[PDB]
Ligand binder design. Structure first.
Ligand SMILES: [Mg+2]
Ligand SMILES: [Mg+2]
Ligand SMILES: [Mg+2]
Ligand SMILES: [Mg+2]
Ligand SMILES: [Mg+2]
Ligand SMILES: [Mg+2]
Ligand SMILES: [Mg+2]
Ligand SMILES: [Mg+2]
Ligand SMILES: [Mg+2]
Lengths: 149, 51, 77, 190, 117
RNA sequence: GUUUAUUAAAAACACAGCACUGUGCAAACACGAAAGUGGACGUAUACGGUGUGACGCCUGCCCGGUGCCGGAAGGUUAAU
RNA sequence: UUGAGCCUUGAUGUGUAGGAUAGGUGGGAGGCUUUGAAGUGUGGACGCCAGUCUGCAUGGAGCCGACCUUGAAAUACCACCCUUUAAUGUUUGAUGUUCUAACGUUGACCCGUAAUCCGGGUUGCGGACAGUGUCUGGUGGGUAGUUUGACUGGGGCGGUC
């Protein structure tokens, strides 16, 4: 038969292709342990609706889990009111829920665990930097400036 | 039986084999089985070895 | 009885024609095989005595559709 | 390629040595492997041959100017017949036989042209072009073609040399072109 | 194919004929030749000459693994018994140790009877 | 011992014994379109078939023919 | 993995007069090797142990042609290849390796169920074999239906048509 697959399936499958398999394999193994299904045409278009949706649509929505950072370099500077000891060296210090909570709390809304401050930003005063995370490949840089007020 | 000769010489040197096996017990064990006839063979083999 | 539950196939009578053309009553049995089909929609195996043509029909129509046909004519399974 | 690559001759002196060896079929039933009266081929080729004829002491004044050089006289039939070292080729047709001076004990000579009205008449071309190619072992074809001064112009010996496919026997398959020589080898299909 | 260099010469030497096989140190057969197969048949092959040419055709067949040195194991009485280990020295083999392996029953089977010739 | 109930009781059948041959058990074999059975709640010192016919002394020669068993290199050879 | 096709790629020839272990015709009077040779020294190796080929290598720079003979002339070079053989593939199986999931179970167990049937279930052993359907070649007095002439000094035998 033809049959269209479900899971990845070894030396033939893919995850949702239209392979062609010996019926002995389809009945008796694949379809029963639902790893595939009869290509009843009714189905093959059940799959064409499934060829437009999740893919074409929700990847220009990860073009929004990405263009969040088109507003990461268009400000590129938050200040933290953290002072300085005996020579412009932070009396404060700023981490991730400091650089995600002092990022969210404006027009820059990020998820608190989306702010990568290398053992840095907060340790001393002045300008620093950080690695802001929204996508797996597209993050983005800013500049942080712990203001000693 | 065994000779594991060493360095400088290509000659056999296996004079050993005429001091033990070979035809000794090989022409012997070869043919007929003998029996009580070796008694007569080994009797003449001693009437000799007196003188 | 050598009868396919899907299609009705059962033995049929015909002739054996010799080379001399002698007829002889014979039968033609169907290719019956009892077979365990997994019915997902009932969390159960249902074994049927079917002809291979039968299997082919179950493969196309779909077991759930075929079982329904039997249920329809009060055929048990 | 589809037809023939005559650019596939591409370090001798000249590649006139590119022989036409197009396969033929076996002997299933009864069939032969015959070459016509000097297969010319629709390419002049440019070959100034040497055609030795069994003509007479009359046709030495025009039967020597038509794609040849000389002709063997009537006195030189057996007056030059006592030396294996001192002695295409021709043999006039009809009631003329060639076994009293060309049949003893091993060459290839048969056809040239039979003419009693003209030794070289206005239009009778076909000789000073190509030779022949008869049976050898398990096949035939053995000849020659084109040169180094050719291109897809001497590829008229592919649509008028592989077109020399004659009647086969029964349970045979004559079709396998192959040329070239004194450089490389090969050919495509037929 | 293959390569060994350290081998063993086996020679079967029986009144009727003698056969030579060169094998490796595990006893896996490499090459063999036989007095009766080198020509000469009958009283012919029953000679030390025949056994000689038999260590020869053999050397031209076992050098086909590049053997350099080999032990000798002699079995049987019979011509070619030692005439055949002379052929092996000369043919350009180093020759390590010699041995006799002709089997000696502690009186088992009853050997054949006859030979009223 | 058995047998032709009703023209044959015998030298015919059987018989213990012998031999050959098949059978590893869902045995071979047999009743059965099948299911189910017998063989057997047995298992090769067992079961089937076949001939011979207590016992004594013995049982030679022939494998061309037919039958059976084995073999595969080639040859020929079905549906397809 | 292996038996057959089929496609490239390499082998090799002791009929006689002879410079000599000439395969058949065909191109064919200079190709070649410093893109590193002849001939020595071995390697794998074919085999009528007659001898050949070659990757490696010591090597270090020319061989040839109608040459007159031979029914047929060049290891001068190249071809389509025959004698027979050999190596990858392409394809077709077939034989051979495992798996489990179809299927087999005349192993053990659970339930329906106080049941040596059956069904379902679990587990063990098998396992794409086995077996069955259709088609097909072989076997097939076990069974079946039949045939197995006439003339004739009765019929049969012989003879005859
Ligand atoms: Mg009585
Ligand atoms: Mg009575
Ligand atoms: Mg009555
Ligand atoms: Mg009475
Ligand atoms: Mg019995
Ligand atoms: Mg009797
Ligand atoms: Mg009967
Ligand atoms: Mg009958
Ligand atoms: Mg009558």
């Amino acid at each position: 038969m033809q049959v269209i697959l479900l899971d990845k399936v070894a030396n033939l499958g893919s995850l949702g292709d239209q392979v062609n398999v010996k019926a002995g394999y389809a009945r008796n193994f694949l379809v029963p342990q639902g790893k595939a299904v009869p290509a009843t045409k009714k189905n093959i278009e059940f799959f064409e609706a499934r060829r437009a949706e999740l893919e074409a649509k929700l990847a220009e929505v990860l073009a929004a889990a990405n263009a969040r950072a088109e507003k990461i370099n268009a400000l590129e500077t938050v200040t933290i009111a953290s002072k300085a000891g005996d020579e412009g060296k932070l009396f404060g210090s700023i981490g991730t829920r400091d650089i995600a909570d002092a990022v969210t709390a404006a027009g820059v809304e990020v998820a608190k665990s989306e702010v990568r401050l290398p053992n840095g930003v907060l340790r001393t005063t002045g300008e620093h930097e950080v690695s802001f995370q929204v996508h797996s490949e597209v993050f983005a840089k800013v500049i942080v400036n712990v203001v000693a007020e | 039986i065994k000779v594991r000769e060493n360095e400088p010489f290509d000659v056999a040197l296996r004079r050993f084999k005429r001091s033990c096996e070979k035809a000794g017990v090989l022409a012997e064990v070869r043919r007929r089985e003998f029996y009580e006839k070796p008694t007569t063979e080994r009797k003449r083999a001693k009437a000799s070895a007196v003188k | 009885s050598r009868v396919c539950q899907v299609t009705g196939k059962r033995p049929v009578t015909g002739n054996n024609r010799s080379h001399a053309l002698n007829a002889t009553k014979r039968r033609f049995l169907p290719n019956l095989h009892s077979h365990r089909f997994w019915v997902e929609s009932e969390k159960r195996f249902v074994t049927l005595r079917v002809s291979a043509k039968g299997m082919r029909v179950i493969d196309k129509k779909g077991i759930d559709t075929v079982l329904a046909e039997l249920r329809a004519r009060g055929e048990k399974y | 390629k589809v037809y023939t690559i005559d650019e596939a001759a591409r370090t001798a002196k000249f590649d006139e040595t590119v022989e036409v060896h197009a396969k033929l079929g076996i002997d299933p039933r009864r069939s032969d492997q015959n070459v016509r009266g000097t297969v010319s081929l629709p390419h002049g080729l440019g070959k100034q041959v040497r055609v030795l004829a069994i003509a007479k002491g009359e046709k030495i004044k025009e039967a020597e100017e038509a794609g040849a050089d000389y002709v063997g006289g009537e006195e030189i039939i057996q007056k030059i017949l006592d030396g294996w070292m001192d002695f295409v080729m021709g043999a006039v047709g009809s009631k003329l036989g060639r076994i009293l001076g060309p049949r003893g004990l091993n060459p290839k000579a048969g056809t040239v042209g039979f003419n009693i009205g003209e030794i070289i008449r206005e239009i009778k071309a076909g000789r000073i072009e190509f030779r022949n190619d008869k049976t050898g072992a398990i096949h035939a074809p053995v000849g020659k073609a084109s040169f180094p001064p050719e291109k897809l112009a001497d590829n008229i010996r592919a649509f008028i040399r592989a077109l020399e496919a004659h009647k086969p026997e029964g349970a045979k398959g004559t079709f396998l072109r192959s040329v070239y020589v004194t450089t490389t080898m090969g050919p495509s299909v037929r | 194919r293959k390569q060994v260099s350290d081998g063993v010469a086996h020679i079967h030497a029986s009144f009727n004929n003698t056969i030579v096989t060169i094998t490796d140190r595990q006893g896996n057969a490499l090459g063999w030749a036989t007095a009766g197969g080198s020509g000469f048949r009958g009283s012919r092959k029953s000679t030390p000459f025949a056994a000689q040419v038999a260590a020869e055709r053999c050397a031209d067949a076992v050098k086909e693994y590049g053997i350099k040195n080999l032990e000798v194991m002699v079995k049987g009485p019979g011509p070619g018994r030692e005439s055949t280990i002379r052929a092996l020295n000369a043919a350009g083999f180093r020759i390590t140790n010699i041995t006799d392996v002709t089997p000696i029953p502690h009186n088992g089977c009853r050997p054949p009877k006859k030979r009223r010739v």
